[PDB]
Amino acid sequence: MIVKNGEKWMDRYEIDSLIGKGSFGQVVKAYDRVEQEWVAIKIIKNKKAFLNQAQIEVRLLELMNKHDTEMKYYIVHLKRHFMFRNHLCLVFEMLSYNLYDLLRNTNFRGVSLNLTRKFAQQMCTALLFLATPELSIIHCDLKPENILLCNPKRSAIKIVDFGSSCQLGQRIYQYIQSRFYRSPEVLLGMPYDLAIDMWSLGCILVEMHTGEPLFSGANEVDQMNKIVEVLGIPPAHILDQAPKARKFFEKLPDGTWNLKKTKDYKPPGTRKLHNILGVETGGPGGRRAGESGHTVADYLKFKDLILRMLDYDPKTRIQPYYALQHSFFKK
Numbered sequence: 001m002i003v004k005n006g007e008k009w010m011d012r013y014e015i016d017s018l019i020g021k022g023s024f025g026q027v028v029k030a031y032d033r034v035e036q037e038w039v040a041i042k043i044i045k046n047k048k049a050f051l052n053q054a055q056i057e058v059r060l061l062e063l064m065n066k067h068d069t070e071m072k073y074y075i076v077h078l079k080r081h082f083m084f085r086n087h088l089c090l091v092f093e094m095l096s097y098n099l100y101d102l103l104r105n106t107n108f109r110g111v112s113l114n115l116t117r118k119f120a121q122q123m124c125t126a127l128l129f130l131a132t133p134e135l136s137i138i139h140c141d142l143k144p145e146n147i148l149l150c151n152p153k154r155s156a157i158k159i160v161d162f163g164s165s166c167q168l169g170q171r172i173y174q175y176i177q178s179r180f181y182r183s184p185e186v187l188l189g190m191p192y193d194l195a196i197d198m199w200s201l202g203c204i205l206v207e208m209h210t211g212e213p214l215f216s217g218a219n220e221v222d223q224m225n226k227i228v229e230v231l232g233i234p235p236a237h238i239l240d241q242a243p244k245a246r247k248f249f250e251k252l253p254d255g256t257w258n259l260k261k262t263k264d265y266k267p268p269g270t271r272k273l274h275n276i277l278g279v280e281t282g283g284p285g286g287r288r289a290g291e292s293g294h295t296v297a298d299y300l301k302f303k304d305l306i307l308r309m310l311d312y313d314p315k316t317r318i319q320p321y322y323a324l325q326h327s328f329f330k331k
Ligand SMILES: Cn1c(Br)c(C#N)c2c(N)ncnc21
Pocket: 019, 020, 027, 040, 042, 076, 092, 093, 094, 095, 096, 148, 160, 161
């Protein structure tokens, strides 16, 4: 769909410019003459596949809207939706630039532990809200690009792109999440729950502070190998229940598991998050040496929280309420 700047829709919206594009269609900046404000309009492609998935996205956003609580305001507000020229159109509040752009603006050197903490608190609050029983919504595509600043002057954020999202027990796809942020349970082909978003968050928070993705796999086998470098071989009880365990691992006579090796990774569990964060060495690449709010003690709290978010076991992985009570968030 060609949308000229200046185009008027339904004596209500004046199209200004293209903000964004995706597999789903496009996002435009538009002026709403009724509310007298600028809005972001997500225009879904005129194809059955994209329409049907966007209808689920609208349903989940409307479900979230009807829950007025103090935890709901870290999610982008869907204002309304309509059909226009056979495109489902979703109208959101305007937000600012995304956390990938924030990292690109640091030349991928990362933001402070204090700004990382502010992001972590908001995102944990958002995940607590999605875990509301009557919602039980799995985002399924958390990544820096899907987290937007509310205002370029400020550190408030909201999550966008409920395009892949599903309620617990309403799974469609086995293959979900962006690979760098993909949970071990999804790599392993296991039935997934809200814990996959907490895995993504853990990955995201390390990257926000280092500037670089924690686990930058080139394909699923590389992804799982990069996870094993930092966290070791997944527990046997998980691998024993995983449809895809033998994509990555081999079981021995004594019920132990080991990596499948290919042609020539650091040995399992020897790429320590302790060294990635630079806990005892002035932070990532020693770039935070002597900076306020980047003490060893501050770093150890952060490391502890992240290792709880990166539990292989989705049963025992930290949940949003408990993440919010972690010492990392104490004054
Ligand atoms: C790129 N982008 C997306 Br996706 C939005 C949503 N939802 C959004 C938005 N609401 N404001 C600005 N840019 C945006």
